[PDB]
């Protein structure tokens with residue numbers, strides 16, 4: 164819409180977006196992951212018995 | 213055997229994991245609204261059941277959704293590895309699980325009529341070969357903060373071995389109540 | 402196996418270094434004193450966990466080195482046991498082959514030879530499939 | 536060896552529990568009618584503390600009945616402590632992870648190979664993009680790899696196995712495939728996939744042609760449809776990409792056990808500090 | 819130092835030396851006990867590790 | 870289905886299972902101990918196993934009598950190429966049943 168002459172952001176290269184705008188060569192190669200929670204180790208040993 | 217086999221719960225394995233491919237209300241996963249992840253799941257007919265379970269929980273930002281996982285209000289967050297792997301490196305209560313899917317890089321968008329498109333790409337390829345973009349990786353992405361996440365063993369701590377400390381303490385007190393028996397026994401005998 | 406040849410030597414050569422100082426610190430203390438042979442029996446007996454050698458160090462200094470060497474020998478044996486268990490637990494075989502998906506079988510190599518019975522259902526299962534033409 | 540037993544436990548075991556036991560044993564004996572030289576606090580310590588270390592040392596047990604019971608209680612602690620030291624030590628070494636040898640192209644082994652051990656032997660297949668990058672950026676490195684130039688990936692992998700080389704610099708995609716397909720999983724890529732000068736594989740369409748946009752759009756459709764995720768498993772995966780392949784056995788060397796020699800090497804130092812100090816008390 | 823003392827001594831060494839024993843007095847008779855006490859260290863380490 | 874040569878008298882060698890019940894055997898008439906690549910010769914043999922013990926049950930329950938003979942070809946069954954005639958023919962058991 165003319166509000167910006169460029170997009171400098173983590174904007175992934177897509178098929179739909181490529182039809183309307185021209186992406187540069189990627190400056191960062193990556194993919195999609197899943198983020199989940201973590202636990203600190205405890206050894207879960209109740210006692211010496 | 214206990215210490216070696218004392219392993220915690222295994223996490224998700226990826227999109228192919230049956231836990232989220234056929235979801236349940238007790239396990240909620242979502243992404244950022246109006247992003248590339250949305251049009252990835254939208255255009256994929258096979259990943260249709262995943263979309264609706266994500267639609268109602270879809271967040272408005274990546275910072276909000278990451279905080280939800282820290283707040284236990286979200287159990288999974290599908291997002292760019294280059295960003296999630298930064299949060300996992302910094303925050304020691306989050307871990308990225310699964311294999312990369314939809315390997316599409318980050319690009320500098322411009323309009324199709326732009327005169328800079330040729331020079332922008334060349335100025336990015338040059339920065340890749342010159343090692344400039346590895347500097348920007350070092351100062352911004354490569355921190356690693358705390359220790360790496362793996363199946364590493366847990367050092368035995370006080371909470372584990374506290375019964376054997378009080379047993380020795382209890383044996384000191386019992387001896388105090390047993391020295392009197394020894395002294396009295398000699399007098400009796 | 403748990404150690405290597407050099408670590409066997411250094412542990413063995415460390416007995417005779419500790420034995421000598423146990424003798425020298427005890428002999429030249431300012432305040433029964435450990436003879437040279439009795440110091441050797443101490444260093445070896447502590448390492449081998451035999452009862453041979455009834456003479457502990459006398460001087461205050463020779464009881465520090467005489468007692469670290471008892472803790473050093475504890476860790477040497479505890480490491481041998483632990484590195485034996487790691488070897489025995491982790492002594493994996495050459496693994497095996499999964500179903501018809503692994504690259505070891507999905508694309509052939511000259512050394513590898515896999516085959517079925519001629520003119521059977523297996524023959525007209527692989528022949529019928531178009532992905533399993535290689 | 537220090538990995539089990541968080542440092543609070545060691546201090547509680549042998550600074551607090553050992554002293555309080557020794558002073559109690561030495562006081563349990565003091566009041567015993569029965570209680571050979573006299574039992575002292577330097578004999579309770581030498582006894583209570585050789586018990587922890589598998590009793591191998593000579594000792595001097597007490598003579599009182601309640602003094603022997605406390606020593607027996609401690610000798611039960613010494614059984615539990617030593618059993619749980621070895622068990623966690625074995626656990627700490629059964630589930631260990633592989634530590635690499637080279638940080639990357641910025642390592643001193645590459646930039647300055649001569650002023651090191653017997654010189655590093657790294658080389659690359661010439662007439663390619665990898666040789667071009669090394670020619671421009673690492674100009675001093677490039678002249679060093681001229682004597683170790685190979686003829687192909689297949690030949691270069693052979694020299695790594697025999698020992699003629701110890702580092703092959705090449706494309707990530709080819710090297711990752713070779714590592715996965717390798718027999719024995721004895722060829723690895725440093726960084727667990729670290730890539731320098733990150734570029735991709737393209738289709739070199741003719742300059743200023745109308746097909747570039749359509750090919751770009753067609754490729755990006757494969758990513759969205761997941762077609763490119765299927766080709767990686769069909770064509771590029773290997774058998775060495777499985778997990779649990781980074782946990783193996785290891786002979787203990789001097790380097791792994793140099794920590795247990797420094798404490799012994801510091802005992803010799805500390806003993807000589809006390810040995811000199813005692814002479815400074817006789818004056 | 820009879821043959822019933824050597825047997826009691828060599829058995830106890832195999833079993834972590836916890837038992838009272840009666841060591842010999844000859845110099846060459848203590849090298850053998852030390853050689854055996856090295857075997858007893860290897861056996862017990864090998865028993866526990868495989869266990 | 871096991872195939873063992875018959876005894877000298879022409880009948881089947883007598884044997885029993887671990888439980889004590891006798892192994893049920895039938896007389897096959899397949900090719901000799903040598904492969905069918907040898908000159909054609911069908912000698913009687915002894916057959917027993919899962920399928921024969923199941924066949925005897927079928928024969929008893931549905932009241933039919935049977936004569937067993939091993940495949941002359943030695944194959945299981947597939948559709949192959951005739952000698953340059955653009956036709957497909959079965960072989961083995963499938964080509965014997967049809």
Ligand SMILES: CCCCCCCC/C=C/CCCCCCCC(=O)O[C@@H](COC(=O)CCCCCCCCCCCCCCC)COP(=O)([O-])OCC[N+](C)(C)C
Nearest residue numbers: 378379380381382383384386569599600603604607608611
């Ligand atoms: C698995 C979980 C538990 C672990 C078990 C621990 C195992 C370690 C325990 C070891 C203790 C046992 C050692 C030997 C026992 C005595 C034997 C003996 O000789 O008898 C003696 C009598 O002695 C008595 O009558 C005292 C009996 C009470 C012992 C209480 C021990 C408390 C331990 C628990 C405290 C912790 C409390 C914990 C609280 C949380 C006689 O001997 P004597 O000397 O000939 O007597 C005459 C003297 N005279 C001849 C010189 C004249």
Ligand SMILES: CCCCCCCC/C=C/CCCCCCCC(=O)O[C@@H](COC(=O)CCCCCCCCCCCCCCC)COP(=O)([O-])OCC[N+](C)(C)C
Nearest residue numbers: 405406407409410411412413414448449477478481856859
């Ligand atoms: C846990 C309880 C603790 C107990 C600890 C007690 C330990 C005290 C014992 C210390 C002695 C140390 C002996 C080890 C020497 C091995 C040499 C060798 O050839 O090694 C090879 C392996 O090949 C072998 O395995 C060879 C086997 C040799 C048998 C040695 C038994 C000694 C018996 C009598 C012992 C009498 C001892 C003294 C008694 C008065 C390889 O060697 P390398 O180093 O890899 O080669 C490097 C290459 N280079 C050379 C070209 C550079």
Ligand SMILES: CCCCCCCC/C=C/CCCCCCCC(=O)O[C@@H](COC(=O)CCCCCCCCCCCCCCC)COP(=O)([O-])OCC[N+](C)(C)C
Nearest residue numbers: 413414415416417418419420421422425436437438439441
């Ligand atoms: C600080 C740095 C130190 C570095 C280490 C220095 C080396 C350490 C070595 C030191 C030994 C040097 C011996 C010199 C004196 C011998 C003569 C003597 O008087 O014998 C006496 C003592 O003799 C011993 O104690 C001999 C010990 C040697 C046996 C070692 C076994 C392993 C060999 C491993 C081979 C080499 C392995 C590697 C070694 C490097 C014996 O006789 P006696 O006791 O008089 O008998 C009568 C008793 N009476 C007096 C009560 C009546």
Ligand SMILES: CCCCCCCC/C=C/CCCCCCCC(=O)O[C@@H](COC(=O)CCCCCCCCCCCCCCC)COP(=O)([O-])OCC[N+](C)(C)C
Nearest residue numbers: 461464465468469472473575576577578580581798801802
């Ligand atoms: C994994 C761990 C490995 C081993 C760890 C280290 C092992 C070191 C352990 C050694 C313990 C055995 C030696 C004791 C000798 C004492 C003799 C003495 O004169 O006693 C005196 C008492 O005073 C003492 O008992 C002082 C003991 C100081 C121990 C050293 C502290 C730091 C240890 C760590 C530094 C090492 C740093 C480097 C290594 C880390 C007096 O003697 P007495 O007979 O009582 O006479 C008085 C009579 N009365 C009581 C009636 C008044």
Ligand SMILES: CCCCCCCC/C=C/CCCCCCCC(=O)O[C@@H](COC(=O)CCCCCCCCCCCCCCC)COP(=O)([O-])OCC[N+](C)(C)C
Nearest residue numbers: 819820821822823824825826827828829830832833837865
């Ligand atoms: C891994 C699991 C645990 C295994 C543990 C097994 C432990 C078993 C081991 C036990 C050994 C402990 C000592 C035994 C007794 C010796 C005392 C004795 O009489 O000595 C005498 C000598 O004696 C002899 O001459 C013969 C000694 C034979 C010992 C019998 C062992 C039977 C093993 C059966 C195994 C059964 C196993 C059953 C298992 C359910 C001393 O006689 P003297 O008059 O003073 O002097 C005479 C002089 N002269 C001899 C020089 C001429």
Ligand SMILES: CC(C)[C@@H](O)CC[C@@H](C)[C@H]1CC[C@H]2[C@@H]3CC=C4C[C@@H](O)CC[C@]4(C)[C@H]3CC[C@]12C
Nearest residue numbers: 537541542543545546547549550553554580584
């Ligand atoms: C009072 C005297 C009679 C002695 O008992 C006195 C023995 C005592 C000085 C020793 C004994 C063991 C030592 C610890 C061993 C390991 C570690 C782990 C390391 O990461 C930090 C240091 C720490 C906790 C040691 C501290 C000293 C320690 C408790």
